[PDB]
Design a protein around this ligand. Structure first.
Ligand SMILES: NNC(=O)c1ccc2nc(NCCN3CCOCC3)[nH]c2c1
Ligand SMILES: NNC(=O)c1ccc2nc(NCCN3CCOCC3)[nH]c2c1
Ligand SMILES: [Cl-]
Ligand SMILES: [Cl-]
Ligand SMILES: [Zn+2]
Ligand SMILES: [Zn+2]
Lengths: 369, 369
């Protein structure tokens, strides 16, 4: 009854869009934020809590899960959805970034040492691992180069990534169960160079994908440069397909990226920085460990609708985090993920109502005040 | 409308009793197990989850809370119940054991260094701290001696504890809000010596308390010796008041202690050992980290009614705990506390039905098989 993958744009304002991706396991409202669930858990949250915050889809990692607990093992246990208890869509990263980030490169693929066993990844093996996991949105396997990259290392990694994108496409299409029930996204590369981004976009559009990610950003280029690259890169992608900015980001990063045509986001910031004591508020981030919160009976944020802000004070959460208590990480993480989802809802509503430009201005004025 | 403290025994079988303690913040079904909430949290659980497992009352610690976040601070923030979000009864230990365990003794009290500021505790100060916390069941402040104690160190600590019990009684009665809304328990001491236990029981009964704890056990004496001391010590206490065995214990410890007349228990074992990978089952404890569980799709326990066993496999929880994931600690802890509460429910039902002797035999035969 439900479709494999149907993206519908309900409203536009400038370059920003809002709409839905319908998939067999559920609907994804866009612009969407995906909580990161690296090792088959969104850290410190039950899946029901992740859903309660408003998340429609989570992200899992091919590289981590292939090492622990193992992709064939997860398949034997019934797939990633059943294993971790999340029955809605899951997007899996292909492994390319973490192989470079955490762990021998050739045209066939890459061999590497686990962060210390030896493992192989290729476009075909990445697609097969994501099939074994049961991913709903499969990412093409690419080759990343560190930042800052020379123009030579940018062009060579990009063209190989495009050759690997065609191999990923073919491996995915060769697996009937995958091609009938999942979607495949290609990844635009080319670093900060407009002509390479164009060559990458053209190659991916020639192959044909369900969605297009902007890769190679959120690697330490600063917000000004990221926005500058998004300015020319997103219009190169097919307008009628979703645009996914990998690894981004801070709340203001997300707002500016939506203003430039991005529909999907993932980032560890709300979870990781929550465990570290950083809470997001409409008046900017706060560090709850600061002594100024020790007797503050207000919730983390005065407008937030999350269950944490309905029940517990800053003072209590300050105590938990300073004491190293697990409940501190749980409450900070639930609030931060809920805050991110409320940001996405405000973005979606304001685009639908044709007042997203004003929302972005009002958001920034208060958030950086 | 609700009474300050009303203990009713609904059924008996041998020395075992089952019934209720009615208090202003709720009813406590006995025999009762109290999850330990040391630093104003039952580790890795929201209070709603603690309640969902069946807990009627939790335990907090005078010694830890007076150091962090501070008793006057908690009172300024509205009391411990409001601070941590648990609106049901709270029993607070008086500080005597942790002062000895974790941190200069005289007849007036004890001075000590925090585990490194300097602090004072006396019967009057302990009662006042528990008043500031808003405890529902206040423990008399006593002087503990390490195990194994000589007969001289046992008698001297006990008689001082009895002098301190009268001072605790007087300080409690002097505080109208405390005396009208909370209860006060005295602590029997005397180590493994029958005559000292009798002198202690007589002194406490002369003073008069709402309930009577058996102190000085669960300090490394083994189950045989603990049971031997309970055999003669519990009958010395007033029959018409609750009997509280502090710091106990393993499931078989609890069953045997109920067989000897104990009504209330607290222990860190289900929480602490849950975080460490030990799950309690009706077939005995298992360590979920063991490789034998890596592909085991069964729940932690085949009969357990808890939400963890309804949803997740041993294999998943094995992965979480081996990966150091917070959700592993959350799920193990919820299951273990739920298992303890189901044990207490089975104990209560079997005493009510006059088949507790058979339950204890059936429990032990299966648990140690
Ligand atoms: N081919 N993959 C990528 O280009 C990529 C993937 C994940 C990322 N996450 C971040 N930043 C966080 N930057 C990222 C880039
Ligand atoms: N006056 N306090 C006591 O005699 C006492 C208090 C808490 C305890 N917890 C354990 N074992 C765990 N043994 C204990 C003894
Ligand atoms: Cl994270
Ligand atoms: Cl604990
Ligand atoms: Zn909130
Ligand atoms: Zn269970």
């Amino acid at each position: 009854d439900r479709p494999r993958f149907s993206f519908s744009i309900a409203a536009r304002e400038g370059k920003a869009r809002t709409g839905t991706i319908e998939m067999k396991r559920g609907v994804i409202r866009t612009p969407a934020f995906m909580p990161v669930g690296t090792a088959a858990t969104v850290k410190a949250l039950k899946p029901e809590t992740v859903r309660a915050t408003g998340a429609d889809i989570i992200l899992g990692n091919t590289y981590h899960l292939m090492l622990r607990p193992g992709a064939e093992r997860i398949a034997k246990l019934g797939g990633l959805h059943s294993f971790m208890g999340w029955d809605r869509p899951i997007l899996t990263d292909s492994g390319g970034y973490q192989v470079m980030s955490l762990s021998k490169q050739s045209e066939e693929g890459v061999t590497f040492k686990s962060h210390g066993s030896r493992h192989m990844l290729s476009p075909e093996r990445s697609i097969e691992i994501q099939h074994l996991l049961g991913s709903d949105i499969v990412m093409a396997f690419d080759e990343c180069t560190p930042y800052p990259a020379t123009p030579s290392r940018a062009a060579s990694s990009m063209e190989r990534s495009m050759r690997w994108a065609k191999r990923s496409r073919d491996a995915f299409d060769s697996r009937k169960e995958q091609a009938e029930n999942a979607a495949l996204f290609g990844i635009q590369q080319g670093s900060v160079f407009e002509n390479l981004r164009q060559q990458s976009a053209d190659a991916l559009a020639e192959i044909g994908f369900d969605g297009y990610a902007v890769g190679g950003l959120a690697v330490g280029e600063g917000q000004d440069e990221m926005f500058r690259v998004l300015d020319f890169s997103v219009p190169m992608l097919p307008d009628d397909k979703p645009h996914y900015l990998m690894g981004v980001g801070k709340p203001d990063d997300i707002v500016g990226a939506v203003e430039r045509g991005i529909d999907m986001f993932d980032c560890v910031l709300p979870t990781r920085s929550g465990r570290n004591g950083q809470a997001f508020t409409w008046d900017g981030p706060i560090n709850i460990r600061n002594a100024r919160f020790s007797e503050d009976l207000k919730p983390l944020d005065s407008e937030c609708h999350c269950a944490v802000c309905q029940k517990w004070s800053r003072a209590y959460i300050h105590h938990l985090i300073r004491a190293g208590e697990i409940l501190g990480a749980m409450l900070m993480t639930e609030h931060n993920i809920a805050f991110y989802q409320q940001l996405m809802q405000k973005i979606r509503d304001s685009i639908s109502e044709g007042r997203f430009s004003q929302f972005a201005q009002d958001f920034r004025a208060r958030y950086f005040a």
